[PDB]
């Protein structure tokens, strides 16, 4: 199945600790491939705010870690800040899609 | 500073056709892969379809293969879809996205992305 | 893609574009399973011979068990004899037999986290258990003797190249591993469409540039890694530099000054900056398609390429050497050859149908493959390279001719045209100094 | 033993300790003989194929029949080429042939007075003659054929070997020379208890420093040389150098001098005495034991170590080069990897769980292989060895910040610390006589 | 001929004489033809395993379908791969099938125009399609088994070789060519009969200079080119020069200057010049023939040779490198070894029934090959060759003696006695003008 | 055969080109071999004016043109000259004969 | 410069024996081939022999062989012919003839020839 | 300026036991292989023992093997041969040897000797 | 047999030419072994006077000589001298004994 699952919503209080799962299949991350994360507001482009599941980019707070482990991965915020409100997308390549399969979306909300 | 953009989406009839095309400006348009990404309104992305740096490898995802045909000139540094037969399924905002230069890097440079409307 | 060559009269160097990358910057690690048996009339006779070289091979592999000077230096089979240490841990082996009980390949992860690519490749228990232990001590037919030897002739022909190479091999013969078993391999690593097209269309090339390590025998398997090529950079231009020595043409031996383009070799677009290749053994070409390793590459500006247009350009500083030895050579490019004649030396350029074409003179030129096939230079007769293509001459004045020989440093094997000008402004000063004391 | 590592700072230089030397310092010359014989329905014409085989083989050999360039030249094959003409003299091979009647394993005094092992490990002349010329034309049983490709198969594999090598090959292999029959010999040479453990447990490095030569055929045998290496200097400290360029780090791009050892290699303790290895292919490392070559080696005093703890000591004058191009590379060394870092490049170090654990600055730089996978210095990645063991970084200024730019001779390729130092006097002194005359 | 040796001790170089050339100036390109056919109990299943081991290897063959800085740059495959690319025009293929339909053997005039070999080594067409087709679902003798794994033996090994080397093979072993095969190609080329007399002599030496070229798989023929060696320069004299630095003995470290010939190699006669070849792979010595490739060659005059009986003649420049590394080593020549003794380096020479039978002092000496067998410098011993000549000893004071230790240029790679004397009469005058001016 | 055919003689006017053929068998073109021309004056040896088939010794005018084409060779003389007038010689290595044999010679005459 | 000339021929009776020699002046006689070329009064040229530069590689035509023996002597620059049972067909003027120093290179260095008259 | 000097040997019942050590001063010991060679009252020399540079090779005779164990210890620059359950016959000069450091050379550098005593 | 075999006492006048043999065995000299010799006084170590049947070592005058030959070897010390009375003992590896083997020892006396 060349689909990731991801939670709808995620909440959290500012200044915890959020997660966010991203589980794979044998197609995707079952083969072996890598997981890359993206942040996108309502009116903008995604921006990627994570990429080899543990690497940061460039302008990227050490807030966000990411892992991978067996056949999911999972994204965490430490220390939960208003600007972090968005929607959060994990993608990886699928080989049956022949192409890059990206998660349903988790909305996180700070309370 | 890298400025890339999209034109000539709007709206078309279904079975109709429509020709995107994506302008690169401050990067080695010639070495890097470039894709297309689409959003549907109120849903995830998508990912459409790729072509290499120099055309050589070209990818459709299989809900568009058939009806979308992606094309580049690295000379104008410029992206085309060329989208054909269009569907209501075909609605979304259309990103041009480039890669970081190699395989299976994410996507770090996006357009802004232009809406298609299909619908009678 | 479509091959064009640009000669450079000014510096006697050639440049030949239109190819394309296939970039060796990773590395993916298998492993290899052949499972094993333990075994405590003239037919009979000849199955104990091909049985005693099977026991044979067990016991004989568990007994196993210009520029280049700026390049790095790397560990080329690190990945692969990492994960060999990682099979000896407790347990690993038997993960690997379990994932292979009822399939020749899965996906194993290991104890460190790797997921790894497993291949049953030979089954010698199946045939050793099943096919010859009831039978033995009467053989009926002589067919299962030759059946014997087929499939223990991998078996032998593995350990044959594992045991005159010390257990690493390159490159990965097809004992090791079979097209079909190679191709199976690719399609199912964690790599892109466009990998797997590149790889599946290039496996000679993939074959070359892979290693097979023995890692070992344990609970009745054989096991070895092969280190296969990631080609995470492809698809991307590529040109490569000839370059030949440039001297003035004085009558008078000794007396003539030389420079040459030390920066010859095979560059390749790398997101934004470009892979240098100095060395002429680290890239393979496949049609059009170039196959460089990166571990022997420098990473420069995308100005380098600028020293093609102008060598004196501001943004780099451009590698050359300076000599007195003004001997003749030619260097056979990608679509002609640059001819550096000078003293007495004979060049000219032939084709088979017409003879003698061109009578080179002294100095450094140029000659398209379009109407020749052959240059002679001296006693060495040189045959050029047939490939279609466009081939420009720019014309320009040989910039040797540009230096007082009275102050020009010819005795400098790695400089640059700044660190030769940088010689140029100290000599020059000495006489200007002395001159006002005086 | 336990392998450690030493990183400096001051000279970018990495030392790595613990290992054991076994140093080939002579040669045993061995006679592998194999008997021939003088001979001329569908079984029968399969048996002719074979035979037909073997005469041309019998046929075919009877027809025929950084401081690298300080290194002094040998002959690699001159002591198995003198054993081969002492067999062209008269009565030596039936010399051979009266010790090996009864035996298959001898040892033969020639003319010279030399005593050499023979061995013979084919004998075709015997099958030949007894299971194979009775029955010479009806065959009633196909194993007579299957069992004479057997036996006359090593014979065509010896061939063609010798056939695409010009009668000289190395490594050995096993169709030369089994793994039983060199054991064999190495158990029979007049070697110490010491050496025949160190060859035994070490057969595979053995044959890729042995050489197999074509001899000579006469009165129906088959006679080669295989020359074995012997190892003399055992079981001494040995370390290895590892060296990266090191510059400076001003932000404009021609404005930087470098500076790098060049005694990079293998040092082993001989006899009071340290033998180096400048280069990397006469240095075999097998675990914890080094395989190096003394034709390929320089003898320095034991004083050379003392550039490691102090470039600038007096005793030994250290061996450097001098340059402008500051490029970035990486250097693998055995627990760890250097990272010279210049310009706008970007260089990281990486593990495979955690992702980039280390961003290097500009300058030369140490990492161990403890948290470490991987190392990325622009375009090119690089796997670190996992061998286990201690390292240790060593804090110093580096030296290059003790030169001044002005007077820097920075076109060295072969110089030294006190080369450098002298012609840094020299400019200096010219400025101050200047101004004194001024 | 016969080898005669000369050491000169004023350059601590030595020269040896009496060599024949066989030197390679062109090249002939031959296609060679296997014909393959369209094809679409336990004996059968084992005739299956064969037709799929045979399938698998068409299947597998169309998926593939000191001065050596001086020289030029050729393309070794150049003419080779002309043809293949002439093979691939329409109709070539059939003009070649037609020509050898009823012979084995014939020439083959190209559109092209240039007329070529062409050879058939291999009928699987003819043996499957007449005695295996018939048959397939009963098969009666095991014959039938056997016999068509030899026929199909052929052709597995020279796709094994092909896919590990990427379509390209050299040396060009005897699964391409036989024997039988080369000699009869060699018997039948447009050469002299004195090119045919050294070629069919000296077959390994052209095996190890020739080249297999996969060319094309079209309509049911397999067809590779084999580019042979065009010996166009034979007979003359050649020489090889050994060069050994030579250094100052003083006691003190670093108070010794150094310098080498840098023109080692080998010489031959060339109509009116000398073809030098730098390197050592270049050339093969096949008894008292030299095989020398002219690829890797440089054309100078005839009086290039002074250098050896007056290094300071005005004619030429010979080139010389200097430097300040008195290190030892010793360099085996034809007939004996040149050995360069210093510091407190021991240096000897010995032969096995005497021992010990020279002591060397500092310097550079020679010691002849009659009497000694071998030669220890410090920690490394060499081998001497035990051919048979006559060594001559050319008394001289070392050369090195003459200069002046203080303007001694002693950090030259490619300087000559010309560019070491202007640095010398420079530094000379610097001193002399401010010693005046003062 | 070892033989090299050649006309026993051929004449022109002044400034006509002609031609002058050398036919061989197959131990002589038909293995591959190339062709060599030799002027020769009454007096004298002869003189090599082509070899390989086209090409022209150093002092010999453009004026001879040579070529080669499946088993036979031919000389061209453009602009011809009195001076021109000889008998000339084709020759070609034979594998039959082991040496070389020289045409028969083609007298040339001007008129 | 190069001054090749002949010496040694005259007029013997059939079954006799002469011996041609040819002094080389003005080149390096070792690096080249030499050969012997007969050209018979009224007719065409024909090829004797040759030998090698250094002398390892010696042919005769089939008309000369076993009754002509070429030699030379690198020291003093020359070659030598010998030939013995000379008949009436051996009459013609012999010309030494030295090639372009590769193997299958045309004459271009010629002696003046010299007369040899078998008669009865 | 080699020092070899040996210690600890001294009068031992039969079955007893003792421990030999013979430090080296005035050359690399670490890049030497050390031997013990016995000599009894009136007879010639034994070789008792063998231990390579680093410790890798340990050699005995058939004479002491089981029954004495050699060491070094390269910090200290040490050897030791630490008999246990001597006889009569274990009774001679003690000598700690250095060979020429390679492997068959002869023992270049020895010890002054202990005397063992073994007796009831 | 691990054994060498030495005269038991060796007598020469002074200035004399006198020589110790050591025969050998196959598992020692028969094997390809060389032969060492020690120079012994009473209360001191073994000296080494000559190495590899024929080598001598440093401060060793040329009267030794020594040389092997098949299964024995033999040391020759020209011109006695009373310095030179002292017990000689042949050395040689042995394969079976897997060590040195000593000679048993010849005591030389200057008569
Ligand atoms: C290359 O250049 C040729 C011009 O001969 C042109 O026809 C072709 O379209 C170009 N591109 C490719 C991919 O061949
Ligand atoms: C300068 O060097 C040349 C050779 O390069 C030499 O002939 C000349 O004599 C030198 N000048 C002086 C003043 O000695």
Same sequence: chains 1, 6, 9.
């Avoid at chain 3, 097979?212 to 040109?239: F, N």
């Avoid at chain 3, 007495?344 to 379009?370: L, P, W």
Wanted: aromatic share 8%; charged share 20%; with cysteine.
């Amino acid at each position: 199945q060349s689909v990731l699952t991801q939670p709808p919503s995620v909440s959290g209080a500012p200044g915890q600790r959020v997660t966010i799962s991203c589980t794979g299949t044998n197609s995707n991350i079952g083969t072996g491939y890598d997981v890359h994360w993206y942040q996108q507001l309502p009116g903008t482009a995604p921006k990627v705010v994570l990429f080899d599941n543990n690497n940061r980019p460039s302008g990227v707070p050490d807030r966000f870690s990411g892992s991978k482990s067996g056949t999911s991965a999972a994204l965490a915020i430490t220390g939960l800040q208003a600007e972090d409100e968005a929607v959060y997308y994990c993608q990886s390549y699928d080989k049956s899609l022949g192409g890059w399969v990206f998660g349903g979306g988790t909305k996180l909300t700070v309370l | 500073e890298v400025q890339v953009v999209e034109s000539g989406g709007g709206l078309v009839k279904p079975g109709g056709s429509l020709r995107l095309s994506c302008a690169a400006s401050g990067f080695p348009f010639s070495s890097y892969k470039m894709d297309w990404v689409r959003q549907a309104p109120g849903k995830g992305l998508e990912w459409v379809s790729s072509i290499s740096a120099s055309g050589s490898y070209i990818n459709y995802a299989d809900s568009v293969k058939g009806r979308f045909t992606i094309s580049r000139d690295n000379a104008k540094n410029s992206l085309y879809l060329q989208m054909k037969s269009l569907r209501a399924d075909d609605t979304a905002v259309y990103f041009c996205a480039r890669d970081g230069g190699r395989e299976l890097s994410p996507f770090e440079k996006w357009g802004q992305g232009i809406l298609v409307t299909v619908s009678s | 893609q479509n091959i064009t060559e640009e000669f450079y009269q000014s510096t006697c160097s050639a440049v030949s574009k239109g190819y394309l990358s296939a970039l060796r910057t990773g590395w993916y690690t298998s492993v290899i399973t052949i499972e094993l048996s333990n075994i405590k009339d003239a037919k009979v006779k000849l199955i104990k011979q091909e049985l005693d070289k099977y026991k044979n091979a067990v016991t004989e592999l568990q007994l196993l068990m210009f520029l280049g000077f700026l390049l790095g230096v790397g560990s080329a089979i690190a990945s692969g004899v990492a994960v060999c240490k990682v099979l000896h841990l407790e347990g690993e082996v038997n993960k690997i037999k379990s994932a292979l009980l009822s399939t020749n390949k899965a996906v194993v992860s290991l104890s460190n986290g790797v997921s790894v690519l497993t291949f049953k490749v030979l089954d010698l228990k199946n045939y050793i258990d099943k096919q010859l232990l009831p039978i033995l001590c009467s053989i009926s037919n002589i067919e299962t003797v030759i059946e014997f030897q087929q499939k223990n002739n991998r078996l032998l022909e593995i350990t044959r190249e594992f045991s005159v190479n010390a257990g690493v091999t390159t490159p990965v013969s097809t004992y090791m591993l079979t097209n079909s078993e190679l191709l199976s391999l690719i399609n199912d690593m964690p790599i892109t469409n466009d990998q797997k097209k590149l790889m599946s269309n290039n496996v000679q090339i993939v074959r070359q540039q892979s290693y097979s390590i023995m890692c070992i025998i344990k609970e009745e398997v054989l096991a070895y890694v092969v280190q296969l090529p990631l080609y995470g950079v492809i698809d991307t231009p590529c040109w490569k530099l000839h370059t030949s020595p440039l001297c003035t043409t004085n009558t008078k031996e000794g007396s003539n000054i030389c420079l040459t383009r030390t920066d010859r070799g095979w560059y390749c677009d790398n997101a934004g900056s470009v892979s240098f290749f100095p060395q002429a053994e680290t890239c393979k070409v496949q049609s059009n398609r170039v196959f460089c390793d990166t571990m022997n590459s420098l990473t420069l500006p995308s100005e380098v390429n600028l020293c093609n247009v102008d060598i004196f350009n501001p943004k780099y500083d451009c590698k050359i050497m300076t000599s007195k030895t003004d001997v003749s050579s030619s260097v056979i490019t990608s679509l002609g050859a640059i001819v550096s004649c000078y003293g007495k030396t004979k060049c000219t350029a032939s084709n088979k149908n017409r003879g003698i074409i061109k009578t080179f003179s002294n100095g450094c030129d140029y000659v398209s493959n379009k109407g020749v096939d052959t240059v002679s230079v001296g006693n060495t007769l040189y045959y050029v390279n047939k490939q279609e293509g466009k081939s420009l001459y720019v014309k320009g004045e040989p910039i040797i001719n540009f230096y007082d020989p009275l102050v020009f440093p010819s005795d400098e094997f790695d400089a640059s045209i700044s660190q030769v000008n940088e010689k140029i402004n100290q000599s020059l000063a000495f006489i200007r100094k002395s001159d006002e004391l005086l």
